[PDB]
Amino acid sequence: ESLDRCIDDINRAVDSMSTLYFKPPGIFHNAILQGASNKASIRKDITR
Amino acid sequence: MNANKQRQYNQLAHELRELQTNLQETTKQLDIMSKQCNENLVGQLGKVHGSWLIGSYIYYMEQM
Fold first, then answer.
1. Hey, is the C-beta of B4 within 8 angstroms of any chain A C-beta?
2. How far apart are CA A11 and CA A41, in angstroms?
3. Closest approach of chain A CAs to the CA of B49, in angstroms?
4. Residues A34, A45 contacting (CB under 8 angstroms)
5. Count of beta carbons in the 10 Å neighbourhood of residue A12
6. Per the UniProt record, which residue ranges are transmembrane (chain A)?
7. How far away is chain A from the Cα of B53, in angstroms, using its nearest Cα?
8. Rounded distance between C-alpha atoms, residue A38 and residue A46, angstroms
9. Residue of B nearest to A45 (CA)
10. Are B64 and A46 a contacting pair at CB < 8 A?
11. Does B63 touch chain A (CB under 8 A)?
12. Residues 1-40 of chain A whose Cβ lies under 8 A from any Cβ of chain B
């Protein structure tokens, strides 16, 4: 019973791991990073 | 001495003393205004903001 409820706890925990969502980066993040990534990258971004 | 000119000169003296007091006040206000302009407008706000702007300009010009 207690072992079974701990099994249920582990299942709930791994489920909660699955549902976790880390926010993807936005707009100016990508803009400034690509405009500071590489010389070809900075030129392409300053063009874009 | 003409009494009319006497009263005219007395009025002139009173008005000039009033002028002197007003000019003293003007001098104080202009000193305060100069302090606010030179030390703050350009001395602190202008210098710091210009420094930031030129630094950013140099950074992003070298990153052309």
1. no
2. 45
3. 22
4. yes
5. 10
6. none
7. 18
8. 12
9. B64
10. yes
11. yes
12. 35-36
Q: Which residue do the tokens 């003393």 mark?
A: B17
Structure-block tokens of residue A14: 């791994």
Sign of the C-alpha dihedral, residues B32, B34, B39, B40? Answer: positive
Residues of B within 8 A of A36 (CB-CB) are: 63
3-state secondary structure of B58: helix
Q: How was this structure determined?
A: cryo-EM
**What one-character DSSP code corresponds to residue B1?**
-
Amino acid at A34: Q
Per the structure block, which two tokens stand in for A31?
Answer: 């803009």
Report yes or no: A32 and A39 within 8 Å, Cβ to Cβ.
Answer: no
Residue with tokens 């900075």: A42
**Nominal resolution (angstroms):** 3.2
Q: What is the C-alpha to C-alpha distance for residues A24 and A31, in angstroms, rounded to an integer?
A: 14
Distance from CA of B47 to the nearest CA of A (A): 27
